[PDB]
């Protein structure tokens, strides 16, 4: 009955690899209390992309590298290497904000988890969405 | 950065899995706060100056909305959620309170840039509107248990309030005999619930939020203001004597609150022009109080 | 053993007396004569009584406190306490070279500092002999150079043997608990143990 | 709590600078928070002082990392008095509002790093902020 | 240095000046008022006064420093009467309407230093602020 | 009283010029400040010792004790 | 308290020899409250003067005739005769204090104590300062 | 620590002798409570004068007659005969004040107590000061 929070804004650090890991857990409310079992990520793949705008025809700033850490514990990690961080830093907006000159808007990102197989239905699902920001660094 | 303007907001009430976006909102007021346990442990060893304060509970929020009447009559759901039984477009005050706990619902206060404040476990505790020579408006008062900040929300694109109803002069009747020299008819309805605080030792080192409540009483009331007018010497119809039981109706072109039997108490003020003031409550054995909602053409 | 307090365990400031009641308990055979004269005979020994009240105790502080109290109840020894209002260090120096001539009984006492102590113990301060654990209370003081004449409220329980050394600082009462039989602690929903209090009583 | 990586350094003119970081790992599960220090193994810190955040900015100076007493977690970041002079040379002539002795000299950030402790280059930024030169009088 | 700990010295005209410090490290975690006087052996503090807070300023006076008590922690910063007279001569004349005795002379700093064999430069700034001269009539 | 004490020398100087307030966390500024109000108190209490020896006389409070000191601020 | 501590005001009464009695005492408060001992004032000479203004060129209207009444016990006395009081009253500003009409401004003053001795501790301190006021009189 | 009250305003009655007596008492605050012993007025003389203004060159309205009543009890009386009261009444300001036409300002007065002897120091002391008013009478 409560609300979800699909909109998440990420903040990356320039010159540093960014690593985010998501855990999918099955839940239920019954006579016995909340029973949680990790979701088995088999045939589950992720794919995320970043563009500088929502409107059609937006320039693709970069794309995220997807991997699954532990299927039994239902843990998947979504991250990008340091070179991708530099690429996004180059393509970010040059407009600074006072009280914190570090952060600059980089664009919008989405993540779809999908399960594709002959017996599996062609079902996709946008797990998250939001904007990507950059914390500019001076080292390196 | 993003500032939050009250004029640039949207209030959506989430009930039964459907969003009731309450447009035609004149003004709303709300606040959020936390409860603290601040003790100062001054001892003969150390007469300290620094307190031991821990935040352990969320103070219940008191949200007040002022909503204009509308042609689609979404605002009658506040009577529906507050406990009144429904038949057609008329709301009855039940003889007995139906359930122990009130009808709980969630409420969103949307703003730009995915900003939102999420009030949960709300219940309608007060609804009162004054039928007067100004445009009628019903101020509802809801109390929340838990408030939160969320990114995505529920927005009532379809369920919304229509155009505001045109003004129409109020008139109060006894059966079908009009009561002369009306000034201001104010109606009040309440669901005086109470929070059941169940903060226990299992909630130590955690923030507690009120979740359950029970209805102490429901009531329907009205205060009528007249000018002291008499048509005869020693008149019987218009005087200051109390009326144990008398059928009353505060009627408008779009709403009519009916008291099948009313207990009226009168109060005279020797002001610039003498004014009498009624205090109308339904009697013990009176039939359920009616509240009709006429959109257009009755 | 030592009762925990902010001096021994500064990491627990919740320990420490919110209010201490130092009562005087001298039993007496008082008799009210018909002529108006009141005659009282002192036979039973006098003993100081200490009533300690604690402020709001957090769970860890109460865990330490009741652990120490239960160790007291287990090993069965005495429980020393240090009243902080009487901890005004008004007498500097080391008292080992201070001699108390033997053969002294009663309230009065004579001790020779031999030009060692610095500071005058004013009336109302505490006093305790090195050997016996009784705690007295100075009522009047008078010194002629190095020799000090001190008058104590309770008469000297034991006659000085010429080796007892004065203890003007760090005086501990050798007490015993009087609330042990039924000692309960309530935990609030706020997370603190409230109304913790002790009724101590000096033994011997 | 939350994040407090942003702290500004005020280095003194004509005086060598040395900062002592007691790395620590506090956990608030138990009410008296655990004072466990992190253990400094396979750790290196790198920090450069660069005027402005724009790309291609000239490197005003570079921090000199010292790792001492790895068992208890402490560490030192420093730079010689010559580095202090080089920093003070390029500092702006405009003085800080709250202190008429400080002048903005650039930006900085130090980055911890694990080098194949588990075949992972787990390098993340520790702190950040602005470096301020405080004009001296002795020399 | 200590930007938040700036203190303005006040020197009386026609009077030799004297100010004494006490370097005395503390650790009150064990018990309150646990303070151990720092050894000042082989420490040499020094300082100066200049008219303006910038390069190229004219030096006004240099404090005649000393170490009163070694290993006791009592250092002294001071200057003789003739130097105070020079300060009074060099001080500005913009007398305040309600403090007509105090005039601004310049800015000051002093640096403590370690000159120990088996050690390196350990210069550190301990004082900072302004030097105010209080007028005198009795000469 | 007829004669008094007048502080010819010890006096307040010129008022300090206005300067905008700013609140920080370490060195990170907190945006959008409106009004920072600081409050400090010494909540003492008078110890009334009016006794029967003061009958037919006007009593004036003389001694007091400190219940607590505190520092507070509302931002 | 940079200078607020050692400053008091003197009001010499016209047609009366003015004498101020001083009692030096070494008060110990940081170590323990209520502990004070007199200062051995042997070899602790005193000298003071009064001038109309604080400028470089100022008139020496008077000078205190200081004396150490008690070598020990830290008791000293600064005083000036009737002629000096008359000179101060004549050489004083004609502008009267509004809150006390009898008082008029005379000038500024300082007091320096010089503890010259055989030991190489010939220190000097300014122990007093302020303004000098003249209180007019009629008994003559 | 408290304040003194050297400023006292006297009100005389026309055609009536005016008599004011002052008692000097030694005081002390010690372990034992306030011990007061009368000051022995030996070689103690008083002298007071009245002028119509504070400013120099003021006309001397009159002068007070001084006497010592009891040295052992430390009582001295300062007063003027009826003829002096009439003299001051003649020289008073003619400006009346409503709500009480009786009182008129007469001038300012001072009292100095002095002890003059070969072995005694030349010390004076202005014990009081203030203004003298007159309550005009019609009888006599």
């Amino acid at each position: 009955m409560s609300t979800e929070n699909r909109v998440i804004d990420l903040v990356v650090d320039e010159n540093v690899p960014y690593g985010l890991l998501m855990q999918f857990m099955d839940v239920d409310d019954s006579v016995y209390p909340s029973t949680s079992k990790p979701v088995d990520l088999t045939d589950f793949s992720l794919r995320g992309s970043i563009k500088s705008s929502l409107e059609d025809g937006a320039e693709t700033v970069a794309s995220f590298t997807t991997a699954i850490v532990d299927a039994a514990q239902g843990v998947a990690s979504i991250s990008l290497p340091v070179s991708a961080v530099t690429t996004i830093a180059s393509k970010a907006s040059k407009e600074r904000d006072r009280y914190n000159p570090r952060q600059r808007l980089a664009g919008y990102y989405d993540v779809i988890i999908t399960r594709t197989a002959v017996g599996s239905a062609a079902s996709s699902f946008r797990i998250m969405e939001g904007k990507v920001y950059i914390s500019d660094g001076v080292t390196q | 950065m993003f500032y939050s303007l009250m004029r640039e907001s949207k209030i959506v009430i989430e009930y039964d899995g459907r969003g009731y976006h309450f447009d035609a909102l004149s003004n709303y007021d709300a606040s959020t706060s936390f409860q603290e346990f601040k003790t100062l442990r001054r001892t003969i060893h150390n007469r300290t100056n620094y307190a031991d304060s821990i935040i352990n509970a969320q103070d219940p929020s008191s949200i007040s909305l002022a909503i204009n009447f509308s042609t689609t009559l979404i605002e009658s759901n506040f009577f529906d959620w507050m406990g009144f039984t429904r038949e057609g477009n008329s709301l009855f005050l039940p003889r007995n309170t139906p359930n122990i706990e009130p009808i709980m619902f969630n409420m969103y206060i949307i703003n730009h840039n995915n900003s939102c404040i999420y009030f949960e476990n709300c219940y309608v505790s007060t609804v009162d509107f004054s039928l007067d020579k100004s445009i009628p408006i019903l101020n509802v008062g809801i109390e929340s248990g838990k408030f939160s900040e969320v990114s995505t929300f529920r927005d009532g694109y379809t369920i919304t309030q229509g155009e505001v109803l045109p003004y129409s002069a109020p008139a109060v009747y006894t059966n079908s005999s009009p009561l002369p020299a009306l000034i201001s008819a104010s109606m009040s309805f309440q669901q005086q619930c109470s929070w059941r605080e169940d903060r226990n030792i299992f909630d130590i080192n955690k923030i507690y939020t009120n979740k359950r409540a029970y209805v102490n009483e429901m009531n329907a009331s009205a205060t009528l203001a007249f000018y002291y007018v008499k048509r005869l010497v020693g008149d019987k119809f218009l005087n200051l004597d109390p009326e144990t039981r008398t059928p009353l109706i505060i009627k408008n072109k779009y709403v009519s609150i009916t008291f099948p039997l009313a207990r009226i108490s009168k109060r005279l003020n020797f002001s610039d022009l003498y004014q009498v003031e009624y205090d109308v409550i339904p009697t013990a054995d009176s039939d359920p109080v009616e509240i009709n909602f006429f959109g257009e053409r009755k | 053993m030592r009762l925990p307090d902010p001096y021994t365990n500064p990491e627990y400031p919740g320990l420490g007396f919110e209010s201490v009641n130092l009562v005087d308990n001298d039993p007496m055979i008082r008799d009210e004569l018909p002529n108006g004269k009141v005659k009282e005979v002192k036979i039973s020994a006098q003993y100081w009584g200490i009533n300690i009240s604690y402020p709001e105790l957090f769970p860890d502080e109460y865990a330490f406190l009741d652990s120490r109290l239960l160790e007291y109840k287990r090993t069965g020894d005495y429980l020393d306490v240090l009243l902080p209002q009487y901890e005004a260090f008004r007498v500097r120096g080391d008292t080992k070279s201070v001699t108390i001539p033997a053969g002294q009984k009663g309230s009065q006492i004579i001790l020779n500092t031999n030009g060692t102590l610095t500071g005058q113990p004013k009336a109302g301060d505490l006093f305790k002999l090195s050997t016996h654990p009784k705690v007295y209370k100075i009522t009047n003081f008078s010194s002629s150079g190095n020799v000090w004449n001190i008058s104590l409220y309770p008469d000297l329980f034991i006659t000085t043997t010429g080796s007892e050394k004065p203890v003007f600082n760090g005086i501990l009462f050798r007490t015993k608990l009087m609330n042990g039989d039924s000692f309960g602690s309530t935990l609030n929903n706020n997370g603190t143990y409230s109304g913790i209090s002790l009724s101590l009583r000096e033994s011997l």
Side-chain angles (χ1 to χ4, degrees), chain C residues 32-195:
Chain C
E32 294 200 85
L33 300 179
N35 59 4
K37 304 178 179 56
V38 173
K39 306 307 179 60
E40 49 194 7
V41 175
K42 302 288 191 67
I43 284 179
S44 165
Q46 195 251 347
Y47 59 99
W48 302 104
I50 307 162
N51 294 323
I52 288 168
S53 192
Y54 274 91
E56 299 285 271
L57 295 173
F58 282 99
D60 193 298
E61 301 145 48
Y62 177 73
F64 193 76
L65 178 58
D66 73 347
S67 88
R68 294 321 300 280
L69 277 176
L70 291 191
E71 169 90 15
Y72 163 76
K73 286 189 179 178
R74 173 193 89 91
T75 182
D77 63 330
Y78 314 103
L79 180 135
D80 301 338
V81 301
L82 179 89
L83 307 196
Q85 69 258 32
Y86 295 121
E87 211 56 39
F89 291 89
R90 276 198 264 274
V91 171
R92 296 291 185 269
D94 199 46
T95 54
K96 315 305 186 258
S97 183
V98 183
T99 186
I100 300 191
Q104 285 178 355
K105 57 182 60 43
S107 58
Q108 303 260 42
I109 195 173
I110 297 179
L111 73 164
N112 193 357
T113 57
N114 299 315
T116 313
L117 267 48
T118 73
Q120 299 294 321
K122 44 194 58 187
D125 283 358
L126 288 180
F127 178 79
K128 174 181 177 165
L129 289 162
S130 56
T131 70
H132 212 265
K134 192 69 188 65
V135 174
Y136 307 100
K137 220 158 185 182
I138 303 170
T139 68
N140 188 18
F141 186 83
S142 184
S143 58
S144 168
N146 313 329
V147 63
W148 290 4
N149 196 309
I150 305 176
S151 58
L152 314 163
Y153 158 56
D155 280 311
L156 281 192
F157 262 60
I158 63 161
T159 73
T160 51
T161 63
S163 60
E164 278 89 44
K165 306 300 179 179
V167 179
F168 286 107
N169 290 318
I171 299 188
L172 314 165
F173 296 78
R174 218 193 71 207
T175 44
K176 295 271 281 186
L177 191 52
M178 302 295 258
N179 282 356
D181 294 8
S182 184
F183 185 87
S185 50
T186 315
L187 180 58
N188 302 142
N189 46 359
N190 294 308
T192 57
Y193 294 87
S194 184

Side-chain angles (χ1 to χ4, degrees), chain A residues 47-74:
Chain A
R47 60 181 177 90
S49 170
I50 305 166
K51 268 165 271 303
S52 43
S53 172
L54 281 192
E55 188 67 27
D56 53 355
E59 182 65 26
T60 301
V61 183
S63 296
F64 292 102
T65 180
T66 69
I68 311 102
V69 168
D70 193 287
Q73 304 285 58

Side-chain angles (χ1 to χ4, degrees), chain B residues 1 31 51 62 77 122 147 149 218 246 253 276 289:
Chain B
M1 72 291 291
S31 288
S62 305
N77 288 27
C122 297
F147 60 94
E149 307 192 325
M218 294 162 69
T246 181
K253 188 172 302 181
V276 76
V289 165

Side-chain angles (χ1 to χ4, degrees), chain B residues 37 39 41 43-46 52 54 56 199-201 204, chain C residues 5-6 14 16-17 20 56 58 61 84 188-191:
Chain B
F37 161 66
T39 180
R41 319 199 269 174
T43 59
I44 310 181
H45 295 246
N46 313 323
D52 290 290
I54 62 170
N56 46 4
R199 216 157 52 89
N200 48 68
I201 60 164
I204 295 177
Chain C
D5 43 8
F17 316 151
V20 62
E56 299 285 271
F58 282 99
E61 301 145 48
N188 302 142
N189 46 359
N190 294 308

Side-chain angles (χ1 to χ4, degrees), chain B residues 130-134 136 167-173 179 181-187 224 249-253 255:
Chain B
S130 186
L131 286 188
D132 189 358
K133 66 185 289 184
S134 51
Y167 171 75
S168 179
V172 55
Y173 289 92
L179 276 195
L182 183 62
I183 305 177
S184 85
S186 81
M187 274 63 55
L224 302 177
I249 184 168
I250 305 104
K251 197 193 307 182
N252 192 9
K253 188 172 302 181
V255 64

